[PDB]
Tab-separated table of C-alpha atoms and ligand atoms in Angstrom:
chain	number	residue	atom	x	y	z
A	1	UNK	CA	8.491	-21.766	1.427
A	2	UNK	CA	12.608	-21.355	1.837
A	3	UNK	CA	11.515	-17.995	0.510
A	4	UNK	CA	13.251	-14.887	2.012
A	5	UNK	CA	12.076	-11.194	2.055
A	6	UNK	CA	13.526	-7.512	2.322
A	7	UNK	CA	12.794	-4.221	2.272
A	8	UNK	CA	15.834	-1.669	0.995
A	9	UNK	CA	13.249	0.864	2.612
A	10	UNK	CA	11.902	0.383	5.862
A	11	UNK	CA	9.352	3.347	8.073
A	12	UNK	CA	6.393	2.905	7.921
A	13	UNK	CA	4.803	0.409	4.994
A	14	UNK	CA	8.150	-1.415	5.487
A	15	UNK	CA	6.555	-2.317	9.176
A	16	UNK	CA	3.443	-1.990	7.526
A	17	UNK	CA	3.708	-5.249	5.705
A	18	UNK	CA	6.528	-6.438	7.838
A	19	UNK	CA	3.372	-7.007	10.332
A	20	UNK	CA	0.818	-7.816	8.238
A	21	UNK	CA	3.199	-10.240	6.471
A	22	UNK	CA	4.071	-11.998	9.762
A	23	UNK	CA	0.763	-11.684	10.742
A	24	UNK	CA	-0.236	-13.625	8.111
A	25	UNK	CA	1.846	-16.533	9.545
A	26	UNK	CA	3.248	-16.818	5.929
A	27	UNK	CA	6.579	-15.809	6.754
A	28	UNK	CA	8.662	-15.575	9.939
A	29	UNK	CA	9.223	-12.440	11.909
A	30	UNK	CA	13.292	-13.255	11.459
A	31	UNK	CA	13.198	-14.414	8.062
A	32	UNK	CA	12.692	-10.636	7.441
A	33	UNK	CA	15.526	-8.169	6.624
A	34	UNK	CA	15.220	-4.456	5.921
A	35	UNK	CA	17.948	-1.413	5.498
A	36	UNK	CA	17.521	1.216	8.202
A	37	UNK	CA	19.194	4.509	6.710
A	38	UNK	CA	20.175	6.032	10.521
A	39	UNK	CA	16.565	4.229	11.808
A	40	UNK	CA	13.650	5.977	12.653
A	41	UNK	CA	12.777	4.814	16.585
A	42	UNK	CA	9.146	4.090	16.196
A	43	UNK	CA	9.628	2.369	12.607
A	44	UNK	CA	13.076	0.497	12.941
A	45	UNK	CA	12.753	-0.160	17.030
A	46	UNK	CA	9.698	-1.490	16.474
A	47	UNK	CA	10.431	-3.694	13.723
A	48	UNK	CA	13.621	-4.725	16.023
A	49	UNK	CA	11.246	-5.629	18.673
A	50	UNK	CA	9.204	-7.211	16.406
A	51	UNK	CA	11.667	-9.863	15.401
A	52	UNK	CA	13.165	-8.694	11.858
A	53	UNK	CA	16.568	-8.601	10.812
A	54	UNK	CA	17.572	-4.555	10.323
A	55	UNK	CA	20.853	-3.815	9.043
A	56	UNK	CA	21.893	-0.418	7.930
A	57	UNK	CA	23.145	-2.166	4.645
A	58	UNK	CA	20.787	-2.277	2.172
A	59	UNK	CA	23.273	-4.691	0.322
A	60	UNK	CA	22.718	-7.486	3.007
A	61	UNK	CA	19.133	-7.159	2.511
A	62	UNK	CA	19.908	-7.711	-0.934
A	63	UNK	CA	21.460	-11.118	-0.279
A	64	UNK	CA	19.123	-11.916	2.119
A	65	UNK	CA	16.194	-11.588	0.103
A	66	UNK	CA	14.803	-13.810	-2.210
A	67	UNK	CA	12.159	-11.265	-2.782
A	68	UNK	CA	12.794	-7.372	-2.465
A	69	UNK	CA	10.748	-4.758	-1.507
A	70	UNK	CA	11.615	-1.095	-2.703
A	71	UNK	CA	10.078	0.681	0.339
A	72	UNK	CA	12.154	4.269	0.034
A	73	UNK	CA	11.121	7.869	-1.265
A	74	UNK	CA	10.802	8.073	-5.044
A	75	UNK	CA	13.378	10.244	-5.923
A	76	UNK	CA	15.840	7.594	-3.379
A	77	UNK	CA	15.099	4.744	-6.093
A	78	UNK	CA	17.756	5.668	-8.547
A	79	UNK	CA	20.789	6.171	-5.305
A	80	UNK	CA	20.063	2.722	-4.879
A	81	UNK	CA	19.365	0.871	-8.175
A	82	UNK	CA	22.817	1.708	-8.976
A	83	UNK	CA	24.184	0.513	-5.763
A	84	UNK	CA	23.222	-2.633	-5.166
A	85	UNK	CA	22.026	-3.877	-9.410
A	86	UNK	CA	25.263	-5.021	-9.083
A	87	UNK	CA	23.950	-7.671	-6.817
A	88	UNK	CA	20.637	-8.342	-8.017
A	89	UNK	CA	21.081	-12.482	-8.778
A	90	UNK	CA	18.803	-13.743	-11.306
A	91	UNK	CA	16.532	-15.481	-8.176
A	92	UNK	CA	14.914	-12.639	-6.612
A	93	UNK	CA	12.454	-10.306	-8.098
A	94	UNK	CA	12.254	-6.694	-7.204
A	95	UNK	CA	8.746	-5.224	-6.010
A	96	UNK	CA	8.721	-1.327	-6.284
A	97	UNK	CA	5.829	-0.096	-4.170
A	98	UNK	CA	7.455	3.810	-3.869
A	99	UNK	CA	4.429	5.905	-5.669
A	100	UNK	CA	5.032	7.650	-9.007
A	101	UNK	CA	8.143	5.437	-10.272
A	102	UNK	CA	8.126	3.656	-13.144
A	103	UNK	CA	8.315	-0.063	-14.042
A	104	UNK	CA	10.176	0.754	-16.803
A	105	UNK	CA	12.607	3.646	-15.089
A	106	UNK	CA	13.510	0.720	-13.192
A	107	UNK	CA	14.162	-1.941	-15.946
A	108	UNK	CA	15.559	0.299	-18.128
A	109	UNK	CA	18.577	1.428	-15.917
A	110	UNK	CA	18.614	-2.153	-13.568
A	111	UNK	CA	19.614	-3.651	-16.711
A	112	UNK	CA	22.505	-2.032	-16.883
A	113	UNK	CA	23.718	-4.800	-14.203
A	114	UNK	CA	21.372	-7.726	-15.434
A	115	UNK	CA	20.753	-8.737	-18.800
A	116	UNK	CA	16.727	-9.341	-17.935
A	117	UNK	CA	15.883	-8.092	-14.366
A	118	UNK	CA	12.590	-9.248	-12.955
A	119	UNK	CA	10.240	-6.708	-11.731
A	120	UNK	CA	6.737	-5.858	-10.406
A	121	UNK	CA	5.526	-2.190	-9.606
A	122	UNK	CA	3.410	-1.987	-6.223
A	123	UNK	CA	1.035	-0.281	-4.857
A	124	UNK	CA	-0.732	-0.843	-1.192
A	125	UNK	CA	-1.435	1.035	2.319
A	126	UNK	CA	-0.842	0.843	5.849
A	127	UNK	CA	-4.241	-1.244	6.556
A	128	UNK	CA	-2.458	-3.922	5.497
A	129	UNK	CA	-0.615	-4.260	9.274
A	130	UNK	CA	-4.303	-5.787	9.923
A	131	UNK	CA	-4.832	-7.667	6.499
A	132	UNK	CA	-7.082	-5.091	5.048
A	133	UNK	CA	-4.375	-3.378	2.762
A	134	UNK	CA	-5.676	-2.507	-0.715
A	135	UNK	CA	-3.277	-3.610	-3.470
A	136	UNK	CA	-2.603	-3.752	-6.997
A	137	UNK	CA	0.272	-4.503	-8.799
A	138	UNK	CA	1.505	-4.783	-12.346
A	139	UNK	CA	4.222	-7.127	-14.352
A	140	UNK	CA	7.755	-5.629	-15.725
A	141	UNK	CA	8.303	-7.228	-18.723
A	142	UNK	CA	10.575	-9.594	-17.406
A	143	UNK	CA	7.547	-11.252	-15.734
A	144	UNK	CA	7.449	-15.194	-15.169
A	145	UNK	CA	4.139	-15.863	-15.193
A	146	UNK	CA	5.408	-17.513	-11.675
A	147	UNK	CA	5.877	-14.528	-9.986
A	148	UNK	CA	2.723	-12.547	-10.691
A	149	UNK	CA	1.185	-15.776	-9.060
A	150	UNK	CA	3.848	-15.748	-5.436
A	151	UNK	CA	2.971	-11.678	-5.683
A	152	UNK	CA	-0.722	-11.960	-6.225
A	153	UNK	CA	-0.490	-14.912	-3.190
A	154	UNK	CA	1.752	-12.861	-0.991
A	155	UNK	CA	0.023	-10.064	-0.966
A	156	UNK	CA	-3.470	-11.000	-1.696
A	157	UNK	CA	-2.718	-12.715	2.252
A	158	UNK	CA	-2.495	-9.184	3.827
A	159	UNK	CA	-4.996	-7.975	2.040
A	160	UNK	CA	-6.863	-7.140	-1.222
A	161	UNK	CA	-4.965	-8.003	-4.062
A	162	UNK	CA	-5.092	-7.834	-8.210
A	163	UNK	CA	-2.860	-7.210	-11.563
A	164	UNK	CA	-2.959	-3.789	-13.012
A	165	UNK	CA	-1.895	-1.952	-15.859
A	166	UNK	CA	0.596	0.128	-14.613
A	167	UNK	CA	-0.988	3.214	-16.283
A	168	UNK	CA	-3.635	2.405	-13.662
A	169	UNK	CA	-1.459	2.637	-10.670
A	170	UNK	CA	-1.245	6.457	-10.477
A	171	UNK	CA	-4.885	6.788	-9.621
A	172	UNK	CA	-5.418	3.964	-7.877
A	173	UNK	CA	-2.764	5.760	-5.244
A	174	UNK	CA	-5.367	8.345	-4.968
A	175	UNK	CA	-7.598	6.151	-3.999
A	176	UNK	CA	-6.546	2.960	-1.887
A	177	UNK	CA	-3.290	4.388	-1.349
A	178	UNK	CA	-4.199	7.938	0.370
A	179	UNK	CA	-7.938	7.035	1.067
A	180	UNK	CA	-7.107	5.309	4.582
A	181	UNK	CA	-5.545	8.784	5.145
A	182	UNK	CA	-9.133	10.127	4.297
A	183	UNK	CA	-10.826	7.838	6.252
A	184	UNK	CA	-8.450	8.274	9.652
A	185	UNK	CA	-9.660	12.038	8.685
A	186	UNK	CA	-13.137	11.792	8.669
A	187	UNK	CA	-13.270	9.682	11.779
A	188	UNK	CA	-11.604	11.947	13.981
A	189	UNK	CA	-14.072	14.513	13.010
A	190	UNK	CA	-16.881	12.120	13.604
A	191	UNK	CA	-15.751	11.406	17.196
A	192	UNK	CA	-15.142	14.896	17.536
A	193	UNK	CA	-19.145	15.346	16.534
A	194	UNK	CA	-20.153	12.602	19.068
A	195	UNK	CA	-18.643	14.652	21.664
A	196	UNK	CA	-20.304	18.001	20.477
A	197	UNK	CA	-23.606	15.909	21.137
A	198	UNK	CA	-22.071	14.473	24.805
A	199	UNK	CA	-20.519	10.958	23.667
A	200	UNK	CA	-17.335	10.232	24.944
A	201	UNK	CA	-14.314	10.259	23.140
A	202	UNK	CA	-13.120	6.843	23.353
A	203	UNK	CA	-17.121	5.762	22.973
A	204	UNK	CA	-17.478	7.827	20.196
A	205	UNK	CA	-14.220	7.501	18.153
A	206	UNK	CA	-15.228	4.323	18.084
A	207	UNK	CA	-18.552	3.866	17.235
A	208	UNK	CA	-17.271	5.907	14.206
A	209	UNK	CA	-14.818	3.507	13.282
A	210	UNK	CA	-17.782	0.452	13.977
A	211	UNK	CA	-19.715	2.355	11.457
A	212	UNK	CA	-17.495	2.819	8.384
A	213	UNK	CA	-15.891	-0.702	9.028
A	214	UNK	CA	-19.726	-1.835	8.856
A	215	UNK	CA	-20.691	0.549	5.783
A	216	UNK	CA	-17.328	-0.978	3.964
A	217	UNK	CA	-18.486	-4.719	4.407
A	218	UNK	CA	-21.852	-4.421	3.029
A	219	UNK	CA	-20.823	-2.887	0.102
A	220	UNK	CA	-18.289	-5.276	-0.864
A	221	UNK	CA	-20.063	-8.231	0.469
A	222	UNK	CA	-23.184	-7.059	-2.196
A	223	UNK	CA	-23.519	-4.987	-5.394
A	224	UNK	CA	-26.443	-2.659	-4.437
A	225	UNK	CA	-24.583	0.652	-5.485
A	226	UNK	CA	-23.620	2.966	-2.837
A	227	UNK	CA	-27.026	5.122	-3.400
A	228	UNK	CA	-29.155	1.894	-3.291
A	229	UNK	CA	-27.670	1.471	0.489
A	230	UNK	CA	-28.034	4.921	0.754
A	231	UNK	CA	-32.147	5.334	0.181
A	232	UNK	CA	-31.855	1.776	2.440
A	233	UNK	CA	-30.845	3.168	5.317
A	234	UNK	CA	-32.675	6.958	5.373
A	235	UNK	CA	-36.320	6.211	6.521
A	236	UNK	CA	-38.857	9.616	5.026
A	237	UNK	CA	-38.597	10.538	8.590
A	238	UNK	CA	-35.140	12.330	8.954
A	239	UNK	CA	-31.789	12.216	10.957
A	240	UNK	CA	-30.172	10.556	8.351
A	241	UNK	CA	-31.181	11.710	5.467
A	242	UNK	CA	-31.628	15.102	6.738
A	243	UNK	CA	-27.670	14.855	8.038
A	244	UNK	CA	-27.031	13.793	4.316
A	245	UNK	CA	-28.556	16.943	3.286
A	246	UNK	CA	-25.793	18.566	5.489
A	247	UNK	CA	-23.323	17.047	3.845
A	248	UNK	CA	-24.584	17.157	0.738
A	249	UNK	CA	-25.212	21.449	1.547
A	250	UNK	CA	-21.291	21.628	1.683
A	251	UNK	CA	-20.282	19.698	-1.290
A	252	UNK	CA	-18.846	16.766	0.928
A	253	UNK	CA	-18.638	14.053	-2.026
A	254	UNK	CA	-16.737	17.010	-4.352
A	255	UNK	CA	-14.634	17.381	-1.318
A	256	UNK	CA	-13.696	13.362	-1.959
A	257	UNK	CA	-12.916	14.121	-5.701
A	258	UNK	CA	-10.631	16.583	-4.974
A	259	UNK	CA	-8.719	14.592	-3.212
A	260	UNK	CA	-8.563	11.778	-5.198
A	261	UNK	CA	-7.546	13.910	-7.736
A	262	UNK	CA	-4.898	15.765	-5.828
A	263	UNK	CA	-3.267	12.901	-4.933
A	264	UNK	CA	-3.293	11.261	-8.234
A	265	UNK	CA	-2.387	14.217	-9.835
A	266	UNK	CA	0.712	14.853	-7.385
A	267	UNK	CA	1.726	11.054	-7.875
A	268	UNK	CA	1.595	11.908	-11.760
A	269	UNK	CA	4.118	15.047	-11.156
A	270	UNK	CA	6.494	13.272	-8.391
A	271	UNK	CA	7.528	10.684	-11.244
A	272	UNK	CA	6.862	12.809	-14.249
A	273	UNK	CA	9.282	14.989	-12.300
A	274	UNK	CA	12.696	12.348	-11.951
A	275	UNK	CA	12.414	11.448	-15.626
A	276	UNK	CA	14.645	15.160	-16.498
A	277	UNK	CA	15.985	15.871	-12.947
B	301	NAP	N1	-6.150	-12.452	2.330
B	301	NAP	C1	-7.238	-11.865	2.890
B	301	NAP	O1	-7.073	-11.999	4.318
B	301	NAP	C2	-8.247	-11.206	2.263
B	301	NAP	C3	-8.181	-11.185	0.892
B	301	NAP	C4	-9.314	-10.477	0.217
B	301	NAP	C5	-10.378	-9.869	0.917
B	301	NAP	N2	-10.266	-9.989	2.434
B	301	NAP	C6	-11.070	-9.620	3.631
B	301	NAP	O2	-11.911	-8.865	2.713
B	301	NAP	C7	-13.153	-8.931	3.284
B	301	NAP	C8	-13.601	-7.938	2.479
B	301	NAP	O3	-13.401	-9.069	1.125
B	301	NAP	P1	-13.049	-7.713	0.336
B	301	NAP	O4	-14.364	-6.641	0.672
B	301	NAP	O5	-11.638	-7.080	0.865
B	301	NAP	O6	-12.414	-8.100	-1.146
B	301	NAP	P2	-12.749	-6.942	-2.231
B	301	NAP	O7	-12.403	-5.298	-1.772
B	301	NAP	O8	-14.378	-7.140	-2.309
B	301	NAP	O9	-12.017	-7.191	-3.630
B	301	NAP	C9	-12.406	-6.036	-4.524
B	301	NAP	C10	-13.465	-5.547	-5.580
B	301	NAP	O10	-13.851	-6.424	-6.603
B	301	NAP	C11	-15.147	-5.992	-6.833
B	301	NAP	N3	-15.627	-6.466	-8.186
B	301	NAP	C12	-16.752	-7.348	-8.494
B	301	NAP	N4	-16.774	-7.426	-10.211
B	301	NAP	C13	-15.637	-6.589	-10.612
B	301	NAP	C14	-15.137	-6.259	-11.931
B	301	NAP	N5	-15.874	-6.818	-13.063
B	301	NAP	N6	-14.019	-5.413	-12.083
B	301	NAP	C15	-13.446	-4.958	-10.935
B	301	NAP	N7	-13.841	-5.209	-9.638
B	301	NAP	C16	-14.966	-6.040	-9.461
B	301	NAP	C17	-15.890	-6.315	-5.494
B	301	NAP	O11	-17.112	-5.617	-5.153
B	301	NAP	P3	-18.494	-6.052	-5.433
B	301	NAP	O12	-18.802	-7.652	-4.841
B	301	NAP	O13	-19.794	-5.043	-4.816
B	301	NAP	O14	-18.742	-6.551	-7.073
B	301	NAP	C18	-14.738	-5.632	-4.755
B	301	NAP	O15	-15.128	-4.400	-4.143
B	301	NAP	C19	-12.988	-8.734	4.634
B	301	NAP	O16	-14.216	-9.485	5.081
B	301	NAP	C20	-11.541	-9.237	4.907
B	301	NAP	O17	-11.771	-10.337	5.902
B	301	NAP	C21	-9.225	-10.648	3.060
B	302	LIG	N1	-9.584	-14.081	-0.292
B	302	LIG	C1	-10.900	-13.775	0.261
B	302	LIG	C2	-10.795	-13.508	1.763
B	302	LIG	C3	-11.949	-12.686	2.316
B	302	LIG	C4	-11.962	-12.654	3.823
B	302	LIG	O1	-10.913	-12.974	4.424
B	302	LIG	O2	-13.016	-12.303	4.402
B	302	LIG	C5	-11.589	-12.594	-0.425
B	302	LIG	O3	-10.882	-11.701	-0.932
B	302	LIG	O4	-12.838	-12.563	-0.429
């Protein structure tokens, strides 16, 4: 409630939540503070014009946050750990959300400043700007049972929200994290079908969009299985069920997998890859 918030990263998921968190109403546009390393237009303008305070000191976020978000590259972490755990005060805690890095990477090197330095590893997506996000989170070991609670609530506003064990995290990126990425994908092709069959591209595009939004509550709101609501909606006739066959002809789901997979396995390599250099 006098809580504060920063993000030592800032682009996109920076906005992202910047957005979704003032969006949310929880917090105010001003009461916001993020580091803008030389500022990307879109990202940092916008968040300017949005109402956030952007300095290009990630130390004044520091102070001004009674929460911080980690929001740079992985391998950036450490050049900043070590330049402002000097200031990390025993009120804020420190939410990583950059992929791949470790909770205890973090700890174990942040200590080096504080004696017991309170941490939670993230892990979300764009959709939260709307309040869709997907995210998961896990402890450090310096976890109040106080702060998994204001996480879990601050987030869980902009979004899906729930703990994990951080050995979870890498393929849950995979998954909630890239997926959107999928999905923004597989639309655009959609639309671009509609039009191969005379729709319009702003109709179509759309209609897309209207569909998976649609196939995404039902499936949540229900436990069915995907296949139940799959036989549900293809009547013996066809045109469904005959464009599954399609997709099913040119291994669309193992299409998904790989994915998943590459991602996950990438996220595995990108921190498995800072531990040495
Ligand atoms: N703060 C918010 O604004 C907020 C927060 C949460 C959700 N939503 C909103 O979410 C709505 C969609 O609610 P939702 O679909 O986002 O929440 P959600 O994705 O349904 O939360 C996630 C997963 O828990 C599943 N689940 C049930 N038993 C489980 C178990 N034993 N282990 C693990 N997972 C289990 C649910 O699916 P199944 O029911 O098929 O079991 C679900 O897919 C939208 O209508 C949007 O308005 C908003
Ligand atoms: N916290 C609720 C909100 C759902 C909604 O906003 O529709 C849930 O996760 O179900």
């Amino acid at each position: 409630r006098g809580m504060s918030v920063g993000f030592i990263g800032a682009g996109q998921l920076a906005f992202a939540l910047a957005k979704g968190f003032t969006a949310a109403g929880v917090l105010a546009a001003h009461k916001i503070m993020a580091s803008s390393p030389d500022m990307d237009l879109a990202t940092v303008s916008a968040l300017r014009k949005m109402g956030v305070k952007l300095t290009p000191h990630n130390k004044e976020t520091v102070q001004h946050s009674d929460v911080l978000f980690l929001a740079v590259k992985p391998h950036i972490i450490p050049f900043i750990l070590d330049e402002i755990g000097a200031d990390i005060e025993d009120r804020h805690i420190v939410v990583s959300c950059a992929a791949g890095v470790t909770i205890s990477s973090i700890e174990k090197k942040l200590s080096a400043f504080r004696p017991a330095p309170r941490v939670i590893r993230c892990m979300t997506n764009t959709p939260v700007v709307v309040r869709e996000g997907a995210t998961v989170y896990a402890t450090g070991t310096h976890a109040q049972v106080e702060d998994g609670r204001l996480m879990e609530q601050l987030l869980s506003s902009v979004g899906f929200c729930t703990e994990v064990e951080e050995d979870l995290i890498d393929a849950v990126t995979g998954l909630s994290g890239s997926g959107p990425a999928y999905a923004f994908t597989a639309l655009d092709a959609l639309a671009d079908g509609g039009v191969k069959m005379g729709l319009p591209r702003r109709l179509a595009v759309r209609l897309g969009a209207q569909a998976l939004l649609g196939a995404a509550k039902m499936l949540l709101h229900s436990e069915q299985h995907p296949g139940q609501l799959k036989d549900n909606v293809s009547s013996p006739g066809g045109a469904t069920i005959h464009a599954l066959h399609v997709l099913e002809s040119g291994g669309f789901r193992s299409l998904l997998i790989n994915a998943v997979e590459a991602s996950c396995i990438r996220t595995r390599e990108l921190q498995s890859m800072a531990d040495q250099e």
